[PDB]
RNA sequence: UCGCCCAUCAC
RNA sequence: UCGCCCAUCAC
């Protein structure tokens, strides 16, 4: 009864004649992939209104989902794909398309392929299993690691192992510092501890029980402590791609601009409730916290974005922008986050829309 | 239909909440918009929290009745943000409005929040 | 020292090696293009491009015993599987450019690497779909004269029949390069390809079968006819 | 101290020898789900884990990269055999990155070896 | 958007970008390792590092306008004052390995963490010793192309001239940072410019005179040949 | 009170 | 969120 090509949508009779055509009017690549995966756009909407109108009745279609939107639309329609209408259709490509048709569909083609590079794969569980196995090897190697490097350093500060029982902050100072000797409260307190443990180290600042690691010794143990830095770095890059392989049901705030940063918005906030609770002049700097401190500090220069900065609408806009668009960037994420942990219902090609209209405007301003 | 107006509301105290912007304009501090009012519940600044009825969508203002609720606040709705910024001095909107230091409208701040405290039953 | 020559089939070249030994190749539609990181040369006017039969897998079926060769220059043909176009490059050099060719392939990352080809191979159309879903690509081509299909998927003799009721006209012709291993790995590779023979006979008239080896490995080719 | 610290360098060498082995591994059963024929085919440990840190994703494999890695012609006449026709699944970009990261990562742990073998020998 | 040209300058590049004004940028000679965490362009069959001008004062001279530059693709040079070396990183890039670099540090510790990374920019050689005494280094150094001088300690005009007795060839070129307040903090600074213009004089060629401003202050750097 | 080279972390 | 100084005490 119906079918479809690159210039319009046209409908036919059991022995092959034409009733309606209608052509499209917007950049064609988008309004084909509805109607090839069976949904429904305005065209075809008024076409088979326009058939009601005339008075027809034996719809069939070629793909399944598109005569299931029919029926719930209301109008009793069937399934079959080599059915008249398509081989008319597809048999007179110069009825339809015009003399010059392979370019048309070339034109076309190209573009419908450049959209349709996908996201979600079937595959996807058995990279989970793998990066959680993975995370769970690699928090061990760190464990391992600094075990050695505490009974290694244990040589120059034994005391060190029984009053410093974090990890990451024991190859911090090795990455820093690293000699005992050079050791003060100001490097103690951007090192993360508080002010009944910095007495602590310093009491003993001549007068701990350890030998003398040399100049040359410490040297092994900051090339293996850098390893760890590394090491860290890699637990890091799995604990945000556990989050991008369970993904692929996707929620607004990922498909709003990408995987990664939906992600690590989370993991900064410490959950979707608080994301979904900060205001757009805190998402704009979210996991800027070494900025925000050194401003703290002075009432110097501001913090200019946050763990939004890796998204090509400010890594790839003027310097002169990458503020101005950051704020409202962080807004229409602050509405994605409330509509992820409230709503539940899916918008995020309406968010991209409302966003692009912002920088569209930012494109013409500047 | 907005779902964070969590309480209906007689003809009554929602233009007094209006009133004690309109008074407090001139004589107070006071924050607007949304993203100060989340500041001015997250620093626990406000003393009353004003939410228009007229918000679409409804998920940029939907946070604050449980944000506000965990830091114990009062709140109260009123019919439109183009009002209640005009009351809180500018020429926009605000979908929401926070009272820091009420000024001339520290007894009607009192009034409000006791009153809406006996309804929330 | 090289040299050229003509085949037995339209559009299809032999080439003479450094020791006068002969290997299969085609007539590049775009000269100065390398296509699939292939062994290309000039001769009288004209650049030629090899057919390798380990890389652009129906070559090995044109050694081992292919008679029924269906495509013409100007032609109409369905290419399901086209990948980064290693098989599908000679059908393009064959069918010219008054002929068409419609390429479908379902891994996107393997067709981006096509798109800059086909920016000069304009006689290729890149489709991004799955052919076991042949209904998301119903609006994107016309009829055809000739099948392909080098997807090599578990059911992929349905894919065949289905896209054969969609695509190919009255008396068209249809070919498929088929993976014994991706059907079924723990039998005999020749009762994988009796399923085949018994699924390809449901639907069409059958006219070629053949062996791959040495050049893959659990590996079958088929011809066949639409009534 | 100088006999103790080569006492934790050589401690060290047998704990990081232990966990390139853990580590490779996981690697090996991971580039398994996208290139299942080289785990048999490429025995030799640092050899997989080269092979992985410089190709990332499957269709990187060129005679060029194998044979500056300094792979046999008898070897490079098998792997680029199997890449036309595996068996694997399919990891995207995004995802095959993550698995090269893990092969990166390793070959920095087999750097920091060589460190504490060359720190002894002073 | 990011566009990838070359500068004025033998071995030097630029980039243009989303705010497109020039940065100066060198094709790296080990591609995929970092130095001091710089901006990157991955290109086609090539990478691209770029030099930040607030980090050293001979990429703010670059951009400034010096115009006789002499560091070329396969030279040899000899530089002191290079500590870990991020001035030494884009001078290998941009002679690549057909040329050699000598770089010379008086500073004991901070020439340490260079070490491991001249294992894969084997193009640098690393030294230890004073700037002042060309003696202490005499027999794992050679004759150059070109020496540069960026200590610039209160000797520097010592350093650079008796560098350039031992190791510049006939014809060879020099350049130094002059750091006016570290060799004369009791004058203007056009008195000790004119000074080292007037002792450089007696023995090279001066060929260009540069003050920082308006980008930094009271630090010029001069270019110089040897007859 | 100031200068330069230089790592690392960040906007 | 980070820093300094007087008096007194110790190796």
Known sequence: ?366 | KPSYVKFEVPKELAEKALQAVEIARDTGKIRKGTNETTKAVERGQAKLVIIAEDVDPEEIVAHLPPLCEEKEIPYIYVPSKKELGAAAGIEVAAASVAIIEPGKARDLVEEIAMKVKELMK | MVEVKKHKFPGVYVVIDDDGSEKIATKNLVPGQRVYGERVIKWEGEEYRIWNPHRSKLGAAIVNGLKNFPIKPGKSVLYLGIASGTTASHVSDIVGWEGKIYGIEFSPRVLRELVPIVEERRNIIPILGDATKPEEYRALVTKVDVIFEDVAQPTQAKILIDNAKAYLKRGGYGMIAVKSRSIDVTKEPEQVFKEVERELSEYFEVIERLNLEPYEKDHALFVVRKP
């Not at chain 1, 490509?93 to 076309?108: A, D, I, Q, S, T």
């Not at chain 1, 050695?148 to 990455?175: I, N, T």
């Open chain 1, 1 to 366: 009864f119906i079918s479809e090509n690159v210039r319009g949508i046209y409908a036919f009779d059991e022995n092959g004649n034409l009733i309606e055509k209608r052509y499209f009017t917007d950049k064609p690549e988008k309004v084909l992939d509805q109607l090839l995966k069976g949904e429904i756009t305005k065209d075809l909407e008024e076409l088979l209104n326009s058939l009601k109108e005339k008075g027809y009745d034996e719809f069939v279609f070629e793909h399944p989902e598109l005569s299931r939107r029919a029926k719930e639309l209301g109008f009793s329609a069937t399934t079959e794909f080599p059915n008249i209408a398509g081989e008319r259709l597809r048999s007179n490509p110069e009825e339809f398309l015009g003399e010059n048709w392979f370019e048309e569909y070339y034109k076309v083609g190209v573009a419908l392929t450049r959209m349709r590079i996908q996201e979600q794969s079937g595959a996807r569980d058995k990279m989970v299993i793998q990066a959680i196995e993975a995370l769970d090897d690699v928090d061990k190697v760190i464990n391992l690691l600094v075990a050695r490097l505490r009974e290694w350093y244990s040589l120059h500060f034994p005391e060190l192992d029984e009053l410093l029982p974090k990890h990451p902050q024991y190859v911090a100072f090795v990455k820093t510092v690293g000699h005992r000797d050079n050791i003060n409260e100001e490097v103690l307190r951007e090192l993360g501890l508080s002010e009944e443990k910095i007495k602590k180290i310093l009491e003993a600042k001549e007068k701990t029980m350890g030998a003398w690691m040399d100049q040359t010794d410490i040297e092994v143990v900051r090339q293996l402590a850098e390893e760890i830095d590394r090491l860290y770095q890699l637990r890091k890059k799995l604990e945000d791609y556990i989050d991008r392989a369970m993904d692929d049901v996707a929620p607004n705030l990922k498909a709003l601009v990408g995987a990664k940063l939906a992600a690590r918005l989370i993991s900064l906030a410490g959950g979707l409730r608080e994301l979904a609770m900060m205001p757009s002049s805190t998402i704009q700097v979210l996991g800027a916290e070494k900025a925000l401190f050194r401003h703290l500090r002075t009432g110097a220069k501001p913090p200019k974005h946050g763990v939004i900065y890796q998204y090509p609408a400010i890594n790839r806009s003027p310097w002169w922008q990458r503020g101005k668009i950051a704020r409202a960037l962080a807004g229409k994420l602050a509405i994605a986050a409330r509509v992820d942990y409230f709503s539940g219902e899916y918008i995020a090609e309406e968010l991209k829309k409302e966003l692009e209209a912002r920088i569209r405007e930012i494109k013409e301003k500047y």
